[PDB]
Each structure stands twice: as C-alpha cells, then as structure tokens.
C-alpha cells in the first residue's frame, strides 16, 4: 500500500508516540467532514494538530487519486 507507506513516512518525521498517533488518526477516512473541521476539535495541542493535519491532507490527496 503506497498510502500506508506515505503515511508512515510522514509519521516518522514526528518524535513522540502521541504525535505519531495524531498522524495515523488524521489519515483515517472520514467522508462527512474536512481535515479543517476535524482538526478544530483536537484538544491535544499544536504538535498533534500539526501532525494530524499533514497526514489528513496527504491521505485525502492520495485517495482522490
């Protein structure tokens, strides 16, 4: 899976497990809401929001292809 490969590549850029998990959750599919809508709701701080957002946007771009 190139999707899984790309997401693992991105998560590898983030140090803490909590932040890596934020990326994996971001990459999870959601067809009712945008990355921005989902990210507005995150309570775990800027480091998590950054990872969540990057992984969410990349996963969406890939799947559109």
């Amino acid at each position, epitope marked *: 899976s190139t999707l899984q490969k790309k997401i693992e590549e991105i998560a590898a850029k983030y*140090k*803490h*497990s*909590v*932040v890596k*998990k*934020c990326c994996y*959750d*971001g990459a*999870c599919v*959601n067809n009712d809401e945008t990355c921005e809508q*989902r990210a507005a*709701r*995150i*309570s*775990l*701080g*800027p*480091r*998590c929001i950054k990872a*969540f957002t990057e992984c969410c946007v990349v996963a969406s771009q890939l799947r559109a292809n």
Partner: antibody
Amino acid sequence: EVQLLESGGGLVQPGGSLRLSCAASGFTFSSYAMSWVRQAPGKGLEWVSAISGSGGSTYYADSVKGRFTISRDNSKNTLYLQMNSLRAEDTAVYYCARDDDYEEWPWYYGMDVWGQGTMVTVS
Amino acid sequence: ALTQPASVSGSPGQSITISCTGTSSDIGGSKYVSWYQQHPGKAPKLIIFDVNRRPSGLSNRFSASKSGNTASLTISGLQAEDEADYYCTSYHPTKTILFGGGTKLTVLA
C-alpha cells in the same frame, strides 16, 4: 519495533555502589531525552533522573542528588545510571524510559517507551 | 506527589473517572496531563488517546481532560483487561517530573 532493556540490578550492601545500563533500539537514541524511574515493591512510581538527547543537560530528584550520576553513550544507544552511597531507601525496580522534551511544556506528553525494569535490593 | 484516590471500581460496561490533583506549578501550568497504566508484574505503559470520535457519539474507551490544578482520566465501556494501577504525571520546574500515588482499578462482576 522500539525496545528498551535494563541490566545491572542485584543485591548490594548499604553504602555500596552499582551501575545500571539501558540499551535501546528502534529509534534515533540521540533525538530523545531519557529518564530513570523507580518503583519500590508494592509502591508508586518515583522519578529518579533524566538526561537530554545530547547529554548536555541532566536532572536529578532531591533524594538522589549528589549520589547518583546519569549519562549516555549516543554511539552505542546506551543509557547509564551510576548509583553511589546506596541506602535501604533506594531498594526498587528501576526502569529506563524514553521521555518527551521538557521544553515542550505546557504540552509535555510523557514517557512513551519503557524498559522491563531491573531489581535493585539494598540490604 | 500528585494526589489520586487509592482505588476505584465498577462493572463491565460502566464508566470510571480517576482524578489527579497537583499545584499551580505542575498540573496548573500544564495544558495536557499524561497517564500511565500498569498491569501487575509489568512496566508502566503510556496511555495513548484517540483523536477520532466514534460515529454514534459513543465515548472513546480512554479519554482525559484537565482544569486548573486537577486532571481526570475517564475509562468508559469498562472491560476486565482495564484492571490495573493508573498513574498521572506532570512536569514541574524544580522537581522535574512528578507522579501521582497511583489508583488501583478493580473491575467487578
């Protein structure tokens, strides 16, 4: 993937010395602060000591300040705790753990990887 | 140390909340408070929280929040495997790292 493993634990007489080590794999060792945390049998967790990724900063609990020395060899993925002047109060299972950056507070996310623990008995 | 209740308990499917109270210098200065789970004879493990919500609004099994000098871990949809000791922690500018005294969670019949 990520693993930590302590060694060096054992029985020692009060006043004696002991050196613990902790070996790490699965991550870039020098990118992470590391801590030692201990737990006396049936008791809670007590933080002992920490060292920054580079080794340039070290931190110690009041109860071990002056007696314990933390260090790391970044070329060998190894962390050490030199314990001197041991007393009965120091008896515990000692864990090494991979820590978050204290500089990230107020968003400090805790210790995300823990070893198996090594038992130190001072008696 | 941080203050936690000695023990909590509930039955399968129930929701339990463990509190953790510190000072203005630790929990009070924190925007996020970390929690650990320790099973008998095992090393502590960092509790990693889900960021995604379930579609029905069902609470996530593990969640946490904080307000002022107090933090809370909530374990819902309680399961036998949740039986363990739980510890909160906080950074502190002079003591570096503090732990709560731990809470024993029992899952009843």
